[PDB]
Write a protein that binds this ligand. Structure first.
Ligand SMILES: O=C(O)[C@@H](Nc1ccc2oc(=O)[nH]c2c1)c1ccccc1OCc1cc(-c2ccccc2)ccc1Cl
Ligand SMILES: [K+]
Length: 499
């Protein structure tokens, strides 16, 4: 926190030393003294994180400024004298109180970097064409309803970020900005995209999440540099056929929360380089046979909350998959071919209609997380003993009456979620779960026993048993809750000497 006199002391130091950078940031300055006009040797002025509500016209004397950093102040305007900054390359105005781009900024035609994030800007003037050297323009988190056609005169634009505004369309002249590689349009109101979009042959990241798009232009097939395309939460029900076949480096695609009833049509060429595929919250009724036969590096597929009633014949060929989310479908069984997924670390199957699991589940030797909550499981296969990497197993609200004795081979298991089942007892093999930390048993109205070997679980720090009768245990013990129950199992069981 600097007083006026301290700020003066710092300007006088900087001009004395003929320094080219003056940093007065993070100082709670309310006013910048006029004396800064003497610092004509300055090429960089940092004034960010202060309490400035106005910038003195004297700053326009800093004829050699290349960088002016003004973020996190309360500026609502800039002096016209900033005309004189003929070399200003970068201007940073985010987190201020601008209701507009100050009109002088449109005369700083040497700018290549303009940051206006988090303001209240409502307009971008036709004059934006004066700034033909801009390569990075960021106006996200403002109140822009429209981009002018003059935006197409920024042929050096590399990064255009207009996230979190109110755009309903884009000017077709945006297609003249053929150098754009990062275009973020998330959280607007976009009703469509112009067909000139395919001109952007260097575009590699296109963010369209949270808009009102109902269709994609077939021209998007020509953005062959695309590496990541996010269309989450629009109203898209189909893609032009073989659009994705044309996207030869696409590696991350999100179609979540749209209107799809099928996969995009066009054969396995669509997903050959795909690494992450997010299609949750649609009505996709099947995974086509063959779509991932070329997807050498597919490793995250999210199909949560669709209309899957089974899995395709070639499902076990997805041998590089790491995370597979199939929750909130209508699956009635998992095919024995699940055993092919030797890379699988995360399997999410919650809230389907499963009564049993396949034997092949035991071949998933890398599986770390298995989420089976809200099914109808009536038993666990004995092959679960071979899930040697299993660390989290969630079974909340199934129909289990017991566990397989093989469950005690799961020595990496830290979290066992058994709440809301029909358990009558746990196996004595519970006791070799060396790393068990969390055991949830709440709401098992038929569980009248706990095995003594639960005392052998030396890392057990969390247990719930609310609404379990436990009537083979002394009433006042189980009334005391988990601390007394575990204490009773350790001191009054056969392992008293080794725990
Ligand atoms: O939120 C994030 O993790 C990135 N931001 C983002 C993450 C996912 C998004 O889906 C959208 O629809 N928009 C998104 C933005 C982040 C974080 C910190 C700094 C910069 C960031 O990224 C800038 C950016 C990203 C993209 C893009 C579009 C689609 C997929 C992936 C990246 C385009 C232009 C820019 Cl300038
Ligand atoms: K939607």
């Amino acid at each position: 926190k600097s007083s006026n006199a301290e700020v003066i002391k710092e300007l006088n130091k900087c001009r004395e030393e003929n320094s080219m950078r003056l940093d007065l940031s993070k100082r709670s300055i309310h006013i910048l003294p006029s004396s800064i006009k003497e610092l004509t040797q300055l090429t960089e002025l940092y004034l960010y994180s202060n309490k400035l509500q106005s910038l003195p016209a004297e700053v326009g004397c800093l004829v050699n400024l290349m960088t002016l950093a003004l973020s996190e102040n309360s500026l609502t305007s800039l002096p016209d004298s900033l005309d004189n900054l003929k070399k200003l390359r970068m201007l940073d105005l985010r987190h201020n109180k601008l209701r507009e781009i100050p009109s002088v900024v449109y005369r700083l035609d040497s700018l290549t970097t303009l940051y206006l994030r988090f303001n209240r800007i409502t307009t971008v003037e036709k004059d934006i064409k004066n700034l033909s050297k801009l390569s990075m323009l960021s106006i996200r988190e403002n109140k822009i309803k429209q981009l002018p056609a003059e935006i197409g005169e920024l042929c050096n634009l590399i990064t255009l970020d207009v996230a979190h505004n109110q755009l309903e369309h884009l000017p077709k002249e945006i297609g003249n900005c053929t150098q754009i590689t990062n275009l973020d349009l998330q959280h607007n109101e976009l009703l469509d995209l112009p067909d000139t979009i395919g001109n952007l042959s260097s575009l590699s990241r296109l963010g369209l999440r949270y808009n009102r798009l109902s269709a994609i232009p077939r021209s998007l097939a020509k953005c062959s540099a695309l590496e990541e395309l996010n269309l989450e939460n629009n109203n898209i029900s189909t893609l032009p056929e073989s659009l994705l076949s044309s996207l030869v480096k696409l590696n991350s695609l999100t179609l979540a929360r749209n209107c799809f009833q099928l996969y995009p049509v066009g054969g396995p060429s669509q997903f050959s380089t795909i690494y992450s595929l997010n299609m949750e919250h649609n009505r996709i009724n099947k995974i086509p046979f063959g779509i991932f036969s070329r997807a050498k590096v597919l490793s995250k597929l999210n199909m949560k909350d669709n209309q899957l009633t089974s899995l395709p014949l070639d499902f076990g060929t997805w041998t590089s998959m790491v995370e597979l989310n199939l929750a909130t479908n209508q699956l009635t069984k998992i095919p024995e071919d699940v055993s092919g997924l030797v890379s699988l670390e995360v399997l999410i199957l919650s809230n389907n209609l499963l009564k049993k699991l396949p034997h092949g589940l035991g071949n998933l030797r890398k599986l770390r997380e298995l989420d089976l909550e809200e099914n109808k499981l009536e038993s666990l296969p004995n092959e679960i003993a071979y899930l040697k990497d299993l660390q989290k197993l969630v079974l909340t609200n199934n129909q289990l009456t017991t566990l397989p004795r093989g469950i005690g081979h799961l020595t990496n298991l830290t979290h066992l979620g058994l709440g809301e089942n029909l358990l009558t007892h746990l196996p004595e093999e519970i006791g070799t779960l060396e790393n068990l930390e969390e055991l949830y048993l709440n709401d098992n109205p038929n569980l009248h026993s706990l095995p003594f070997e639960l005392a052998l679980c030396s890392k057990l720090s969390i247990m719930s048993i609310e609404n379990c009768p436990l009537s083979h245990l002394p009433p006042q013990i189980v009334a005391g809750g988990p601390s007394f129950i575990i204490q009773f199992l350790k001191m009054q069981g056969p392992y008293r000497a080794m725990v």
